[PDB]
Write an enzyme that holds these catalytic residues in place. Structure first.
Site, short mmCIF file in Angstrom:
data_model
loop_
_atom_site.label_atom_id
_atom_site.label_comp_id
_atom_site.label_asym_id
_atom_site.label_seq_id
_atom_site.Cartn_x
_atom_site.Cartn_y
_atom_site.Cartn_z
N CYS A 116 0.83 -1.21 0.00
CA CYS A 116 0.00 0.00 0.00
C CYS A 116 0.87 1.25 0.00
O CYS A 116 0.37 2.26 -0.56
CB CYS A 116 -1.03 -0.01 1.14
SG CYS A 116 -0.46 -0.62 2.75
N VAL A 166 0.02 4.31 -2.54
CA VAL A 166 -0.33 5.64 -2.04
C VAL A 166 0.63 6.67 -2.65
O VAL A 166 0.13 7.75 -3.03
CB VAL A 166 -0.29 5.71 -0.50
CG1 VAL A 166 -0.40 7.15 0.00
CG2 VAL A 166 -1.45 4.93 0.12
S1 CLF Z 1 5.51 -2.70 5.90
FE1 CLF Z 1 4.55 -3.26 7.94
S2 CLF Z 1 3.25 -5.01 7.40
FE2 CLF Z 1 3.62 -3.87 5.43
S3 CLF Z 1 1.67 -2.38 4.98
FE3 CLF Z 1 3.54 -1.45 6.03
S4 CLF Z 1 3.03 -1.45 8.27
FE4 CLF Z 1 1.95 -3.14 7.20
FE5 CLF Z 1 -1.11 -4.87 5.95
S5 CLF Z 1 -2.43 -3.95 4.42
FE6 CLF Z 1 -1.18 -5.46 3.22
S6 CLF Z 1 0.45 -6.13 4.76
FE7 CLF Z 1 1.30 -4.30 3.64
S7 CLF Z 1 0.10 -4.25 1.69
FE8 CLF Z 1 -1.39 -2.75 2.70
#
Ligand code: CLF
Ligand code: CFM
Ligand code: CLF
Ligand SMILES: [Cl-]
Ligand SMILES: [Cl-]
Ligand SMILES: [Mg+2]
Ligand SMILES: [Mg+2]
Ligand SMILES: [Mg+2]
Ligand SMILES: [Mg+2]
Ligand SMILES: [Mg+2]
Lengths: 519, 478, 519, 478
Positions: free
Chosen positions: A151, A155
């Site tokens: 994400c 974004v």
């Molecule tokens: S580096 Fe760490 S685990 Fe990664 S997003 Fe970022 S805080 Fe989370 Fe949750 S929702 Fe899925 S896993 Fe990501 S792509 Fe969007």
């Protein structure tokens, strides 16, 4: 303390008197709520009044029953030969995708990240994409690097297509390597949307410039969508071989998720080959076996390959397997094999043999949209009542179709369908609607625990069918599609009924007037 | 160096030959061979740097370090995974940070609370959703003592201001509502999430009871940096209470907001995980004049050392108690060593874990006659590598942030008898024929801290190293 | 009383207040022993003192773990093509053999009697045989009428061979019908002895005067002995087809015990043909897969057919399957198939993935001699301790071989082997030796219930592997031999461990500190 | 006869053309078509003959009738299966004759006690082994009230004398020890086992408390011939007790030796199963002057008829109580007919069971609108055929001791919508696509007696006749 002859792990070590005294003493330093108040609040969470407030939620989600897009792109990618999944974005996602599948399949899971951090948030991740493709190619020597996104990458607006074009132009990735890609934003849809998005990226990379001709090859392609039972990939190939109808699965991770422990690690094994994917447009047709999630895949088959995309239901149960085989037979002009008719008749014998324990039983169930529609359909066909049907990631068009199917069945009269609701919503529904059993994944263990704490009479036991399955071993080897899969489902449901009835009738001198030897 | 050391330096060169030149030179600084006489690594190794893109690092992110490691264990608070649905689902009940309680009622660590971001939350921002979420949470979960907000990648990127939300909701709820900017793109690994979380605790939790009455004793301590994996902290707490100390708080395995707010009233902070919580320990020394010390509860040699040094910060009564506790468990220790050391003596072990255990478990292995031949960390800093040097034999391979490729290559060349590492490493090395024990989750066993834990550790190493299936990887006709 | 919207069967109808009151009133008319005296006696039956008295029995048998010879002959007979099992003697026996197999297989069972009564007790059963063969031939049109005997017939000393010759000479049964016979006294041995006797009768009928030559056909014959899992007949055929080694099973009832429910009843289906049995002496060899019970069948192979009778262990577990395939390879001269070696490696992967839950677990086990030896072997291979091992129908030579195997293993140090002991003995052993689990058939359910009544801490859960299995459905379709069957056994054992650990850790606020999502 | 009678007479002829001429002529006397103007079967049918050798009769033996049916249900006695191991193992817990108690301690019906004859017992005789078995039984099972010895085939054949042993052992133990010569070669079916067993009860049990004081009421009755299948006798006893009667004894479902010994003190014997226990009811009328009557507790029509007739043997108080009970359950009965009769009416049934239920359940099927097109018995006698005639519609096929060939041919031709029969018939007819309910074991459901049983019977016939799987036997492409 521990004795040498019988060392106890955490449970039951902490049941020992010295640890019970430790806990009583530690509790005095926590300012705990009194037991009476905690009991009052637990009871209140089992009520219809709490349920109504729970179903007023508009912002808080609790105990979701879905994951995010890139998980599904990774699983689709694992199903192609010599393919390395690669997720452009931040690395914590890839540690979690790998771990999630490690714990369900009890297998290693290859997947890389390009580790975008604070620097890439400001400049965009084109440098990470160049170095990432370069280092992954060197270390892991894939024939295909299949790229999806996290994400953060979505974004900030990283232009995937352009980045990969630059890596190619500047020599970071060789011309011998294919780099299909898809945008997979985790704030849209769920893991099933990621799988479909990744499949469209493979179709574009391998077939967009191909001038195909449906029926040039007398074969059928099959597309499973997001599926975590190895037996389902295998049964489809086995049935097609019995039909004598050439077949390719397009995305088949069943060999790389089941490599032998023989002294060698094999990062790649089996999978759909580049020849299978490239010649896909020449098949008679492609059958999309989970139709609600394979949305862009249907546009591929019709708009890119100009094939029929014959509509098929998920092949779960007796009638949906009959319909798949009649479709294969009609498209290919080949008769249904006598060994398949024999198998079908043995499933019907099992259904007649076990019907008196299943008829009228009431089930709650949850999972992905295609799975929940197929399992609800087969429960109706068994004469069971699927009273509470939940799919967190399903949409309003699916819900209309489910309600249409339930209204047309005598066994759907008391069924309620819930979309965009989670397992904290399901927990209330197990307390208020109290079906006999609930079919779900390992997250349902805590709902069985919660219902048991109201009382033995209120327990709703869990039957494990779905994903993820983390607290039993080797269930991912099983089959749930075809007649073979329906035999597993029937056996699993009747023996869940019979294990619960034995437990209920196992009290010596009290309920064991009905602890019958023969059932 | 010695012969073992030369062989490891040659192995280093052979392994790194596969890397593109730029990464090759950078990676060479992340590995060295140990010298028994060295006291600090100096320029021999570098760590806590970005991972190389595309290499299959083992590391996680800062949300894993904050939500997954430091805050997630606190049982009496609700922790909100704020952002899209993955992060909170993949990290739901993966780490065995044990606690007791009534789930969903007075204790929340197995529930997954999330704001399940959708596209409209990205285009319009998530603070209004967050505020409404917390109202709904207070209605359905009235017994929380406080709430945390764990930010996932999108939150800061779209410009949301969760601190303003936390301050407003804390006034409406009359409970602490704690904002954490632990987005996973910050820092380079789980480690910055620790640091972020310690700074958050410092400002939003630790001062909440300043100037309040608290009834103390002379022997009040806090366990800092024990997350109770498999009940490790309970098996450590019992020894400290047997020695006559009062454990006022446990950070954060089976921990509570209340215990943490009472920590500035203790006499001594006992730091087990230096990496994750040295920050707050140093802060309490500076602000509240509470001394702290590192200790190690893995195996009988380090437990006796630790009990003696902890007791030596107090008076002769506790010193005598330290001796009585060690004598009370002597029989049990001697029987464990006599049963299992003969089954394990001389076997060689490779260890690869986060930020502490790669050096912390070496004494327990040595108490069963086992030898470490390589040790590495995912995300340790140079002060952790300094702390590893006293417990390595000369020539041992010591390394940082290894790719899957490097770890596979080290194992194929070193041929360890046993590997201790994580879940993403387990099923690769078992197919290679190497006995493997998960040394994060304890392979669903534990505890391994304390005297009760050493018995379990020894049973478990024997169980896996000597299992009969390891003689069956090659078919009998081959 | 009953409500229309929720009708309750026996359990839990009788839990209602009106029926609890009814039971109190009836109890006043029974001169019931007092409740404290009954509790006292029950507690006494769980002790070591009681066990010592129990192990002094010489004449009383309680809850046997074996059946009688003709049951075995009927099962052997069912494995031949177009064969009607016929038991010369009294009819009660045949109602009971059919019913016993009906309740395990969930299938019809064809078997006839010639209904010898008091008249036949006086004059001999010659008229019953004549009329019985004529009437069976007319109504059921078999090609083969496979005759065995009930104890009445044996005590009276009816001369089967002479009766069957007289029937053919007098015109009661057509000469073209094959009528193999065997003497199967139920006061000798058990149902496995019946099976082996019946097989010797088929071999006499079809091969006595044949001038055979081993290796004239490049095939192997397989002989399973008494076996009630359909998957074991089927896996042996599948593995031999992968090995590309021609094969016949001699006695294969797996088709007639699984006909389809398709609107037709098929009394006969599949089975060893007459051509397969008649050419059996021309194979390279005949492999006797349950060697302890296949005693007269080994004499057939070696004395009649002049084949090696290459010794093989029951093909249960990893090492025993390996030995089977190495033996097939050495006799045939064909290499082991690459698909089998891949299957082997996947079983080893399962074993390594599940070992921490199985290592050191203690099991009790009972069943037929060949099965108990095989499963004890595999449990040692897994790092489990088979502490209590019982086989009611085993002999001293088998017990010596078992203790030799146990003494050699690191995992057999606390193992005790019992022969000519029954399930009331086994019940005492479950109280005094307390293994973690017991592996048995449906009769073990009463022992689980008895151990639970002493307390939850003393409960020994039952794992169903064996025969008969009457209280769960469709377990008879499973496989227990080969790598495929070892995969089933591994999954069953580990998931039984994990189901019990979940139940033990499922008490909200008390033991659920260890109710782990991931195991 | 009518057009159904003619079609059935032609079917009888067609079916029997398969039999060798003499068996054909013999078998023709075992079937007929009903005539509503006939009071007696007279010469129209014959029954209780030897079975035809080799035809696959459904029948069992005299040990099944004695041990399996009459004695095995008696919960406070231990029943020995005396002979080789089969008989007692095949009959272990196959019949659902429900009882309450503590298994192996004060109640023994699910244990299998056997003398497990071996060749030496055949050769030297089994009386000494029987005597020693009974001593070990008493040491290990001290709370038995009495012991029975159920002879298997070999016992009388080898010349053993179990009456001498029972006499000696009963003195040695000072408890009743009762010998039964119910060897399976005796008689022709289960039936002679019933008769044998009734004669043993007459001589060895019923006189045991003669001359002794016993507190009576004017409304004391015994239930004679209800073996409590799935709790059928409890569902019956409750109505009699609600009507103001005291059920002093139940023979033998949930029964006891004590209750049997107190049966000679009752006022009225209530016979449900006429076949198996009319013998002892006639004996009690002649010796003890206790009247008896047959009754039927299947379905609301028969229940009300039975309650009124039973109450008519007492006085106006019990007569009024019968009307009160019937009124009390009338709403439950109307709801069951309103829900299930529309789902069953018009459908045709074929019944084939032992000695009672093929006629006894016809009222309950007719209350749900169903029609019986054929009814047969394994081992009934002509007085049972006589009692069947009042409940058959003209032209119904009525038959005796059918082979499997004959049952399959009747089913194929008549095409019933539902079959009620046993476990050996169940899986054949399901494959033929005919809904099937086990009418011995209740297909693991029940009770079916009484008002509470009628609800379950209606639920069960609907569940099976209307199950959706019966529309799936033919593949849709066929
Ligand atoms: S580096 Fe760490 S685990 Fe990664 S997003 Fe970022 S805080 Fe989370 Fe949750 S929702 Fe899925 S896993 Fe990501 S792509 Fe969007
Ligand atoms: S990998 Fe500990 S610095 Fe941190 S979750 Fe494991 S070696 Fe962490 S000891 Fe701890 S409980 Fe851990 S095992 Fe420090 S907490 S970020 Mo993965
Ligand atoms: S007609 Fe009846 S059931 Fe038959 S023997 Fe006779 S009493 Fe008994 Fe038990 S042991 Fe087996 S089944 Fe028989 S053959 Fe020897
Ligand atoms: Cl959908
Ligand atoms: Cl033996
Ligand atoms: Mg694996
Ligand atoms: Mg608490
Ligand atoms: Mg069947
Ligand atoms: Mg020994
Ligand atoms: Mg009682």
């Amino acid at each position: 303390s521990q004795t040498i002859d019988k060392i106890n792990s955490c449970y039951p070590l902490f049941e020992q008197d010295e640890y019970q005294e430790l806990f009583r003493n530690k509790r005095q330093l926590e300012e705990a709520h009194d037991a009476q108040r905690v009991q009052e609040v637990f009871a209140w969470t089992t009520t219809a009044e709490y349920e109504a407030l729970n179903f007023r939620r508009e912002a808080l989600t609790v105990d979701p029953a879905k994951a995010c897009q890139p998980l599904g792109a990774v699983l689709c990618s694992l199903g192609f030969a010599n393919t390395l999944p690669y997720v452009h974005g931040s690395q914590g996602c890839v540690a979690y995708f790998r771990t999630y599948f490690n714990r369900h399949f009890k297998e290693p899971i290859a997947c890389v990240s390009d580790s975008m951090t604070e620097d890439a948030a400001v400049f965009g991740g084109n440098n990470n994409m160049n170095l990432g493709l370069q280092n992954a190619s060197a270390l892991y020597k894939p024939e295909i690097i299949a790229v999806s996104t996290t994400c953060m990458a979505e974004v900030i607006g990283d232009d995937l297509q352009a980045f990969i074009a630059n890596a190619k132009k500047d020599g970071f990735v060789d011309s011998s390597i294919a780099v299909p890609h898809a945008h997979t934003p985790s704030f849209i849809g769920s893991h099933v949307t990621g799988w479909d998005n990744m499949f469209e990226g493979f179709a574009k990379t391998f077939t967009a410039d191909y001038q195909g001709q449906p029926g040039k090859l007398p074969k059928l392609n099959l597309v499973t969508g997001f599926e975590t039972y190895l037996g389902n990939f295998r049964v489809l190939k086995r049935m097609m071989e019995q039909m004598a109808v050439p077949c390719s699965l397009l995305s088949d991770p069943s060999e790389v998720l089941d490599t032998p422990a023989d002294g060698h690690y094999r990062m790649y094994s089996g999978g759909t080959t580049q020849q299978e994917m490239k010649e896909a447009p020449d098949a008679i047709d492609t059958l999309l076996l989970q139709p609600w999630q394979l949305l862009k895949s249907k546009k591929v088959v019709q708009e890119m390959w100009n094939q029929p995309a014959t509509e098929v239901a998920i092949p779960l149960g007796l009638a949906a397997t009959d319909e798949l085989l009649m479709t294969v037979s009609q498209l290919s002009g080949k008769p249904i094999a006598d060994a398949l008719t024999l198998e079908r008749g043995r499933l019907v014998d099992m259904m007649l043999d076990s019907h008196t324990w299943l008829h009228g039983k009431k089930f709650g169930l949850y999972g992905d949209p295609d799975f929940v529609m197929g399992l609800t359909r087969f429960l109706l066909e068994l004469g069971c009542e699927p009273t509470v049907i939940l799919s967190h990631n399903a949409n309003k068009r699916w819900q209309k179709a489910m309600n249409k199917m339930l209204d047309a069945s005598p066994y759907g009269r008391d069924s309620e369908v819930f979309i965009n609701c989670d397992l904290w919503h399901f927990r209330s529904l197990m307390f208020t609607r109290q079906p006999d059993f609930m079919i779900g994944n390992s997250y349902g263990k805590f709902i069985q625990r919660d219902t048991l704490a109201k009382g033995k009479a209120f327990e709703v036991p869990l039957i494990r069918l779905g994903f993820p399955l983390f607290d039993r071993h080797h269930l991912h080897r099983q089959t749930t599609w075809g007649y073979e899969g329906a035999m597993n489902i029937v056996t699993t449901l009747v023996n869940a009924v019979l294990e619960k009835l034995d437990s209920d009738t196992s009290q010596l001198g009290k309920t064991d007037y009905s602890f019958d030897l023969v059932r | 160096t010695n012969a073992t050391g030369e062989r490891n330096l040659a192995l280093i060169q052979e392994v790194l030959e596969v890397f593109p030149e730029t990464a090759r030179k950078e990676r060479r600084k992340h590995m060295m061979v140990s010298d028994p006489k060295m006291k600090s690594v100096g320029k021999c190794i570098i760590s806590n740097r970005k991972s190389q893109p595309g290499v299959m690092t083992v590391r996680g992110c800062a949300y894993a370090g904050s939500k997954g490691v430091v805050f997630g264990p606190i049982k009496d608070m609700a922790h909100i995974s704020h952002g899209p649905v993955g992060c909170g689902q993949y990290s739901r009940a993966g780490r065995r940070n044990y606690y007791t309680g009534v789930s969903g009622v007075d204790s929340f660590g197995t529930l997954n609370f999330t704001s399940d971001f959708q596209e409209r939350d990205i285009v319009f921002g998530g603070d209004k959703k967050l505020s409404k979420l917390i109202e709904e949470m207070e209605l359905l979960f009235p017994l929380t003592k406080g709430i945390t907000i764990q930010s996932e990648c999108p939150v800061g990127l779209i410009g949301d201001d969760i601190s303003a939300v936390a301050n407003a909701s804390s006034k409406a709820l009359d409970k602490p509502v704690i904002p954490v900017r632990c987005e996973g793109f910050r820092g380079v690994s789980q480690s910055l999430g620790h640091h972020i979380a310690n700074d958050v605790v410092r400002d939003w939790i630790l001062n909440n009871r300043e100037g309040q009455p608290f009834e103390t004793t002379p022997y009040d301590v806090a366990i800092i940096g024990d997350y109770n994996i498999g009940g490790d902290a309970w098996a450590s707490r019992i020894l400290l209470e047997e020695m006559g100390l009062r454990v006022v708080a446990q950070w954060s395995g089976d921990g509570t907001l209340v215990e943490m707010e009472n920590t500035p009233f203790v006499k001594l902070n006992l730091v087990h995980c230096y990496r994750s919580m040295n920050y707050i320990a140093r802060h309490m020394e500076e602000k509240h004049q509470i001394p702290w010390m590192e200790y190690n509860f893995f195996g009988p040699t380090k437990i006796a050392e630790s009990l003696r040094k902890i007791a030596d910060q107090f008076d002769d009564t506790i010193r005598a108690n330290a001796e009585a506790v060690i004598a009370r468990y002597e029989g049990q220790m001697a029987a464990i060593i006599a049963k299992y050391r003969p089954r394990l003596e001389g076997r060689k072990v490779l260890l690869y874990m986060g930020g502490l255990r790669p050096r912390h478990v070496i004494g327990a292995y040595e108490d069963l006659g086992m030898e470490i031949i390589a040790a590495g960390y995912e995300f340790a800093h140079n002060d952790d590598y300094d702390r590893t040097l006293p417990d390595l034999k000369e020539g041992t391979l010591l390394f940082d942030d290894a790719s899957s490729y490097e770890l596979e290559a080290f194992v194929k060349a070193l041929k360890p008898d046993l590997i201790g590492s994580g879940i993403k490493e387990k099923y690769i090395f078992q197919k290679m024929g190497v006995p493997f024990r998960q040394m994060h989750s304890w392979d669903y066993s534990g505890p391994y801290h304390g005297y009760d834990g050493f018995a379990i550790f020894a049973r478990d190493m024997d169980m896996t190293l000597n299992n009969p299936a390891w003689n069956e990887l090659t078919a009998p006709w081959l």
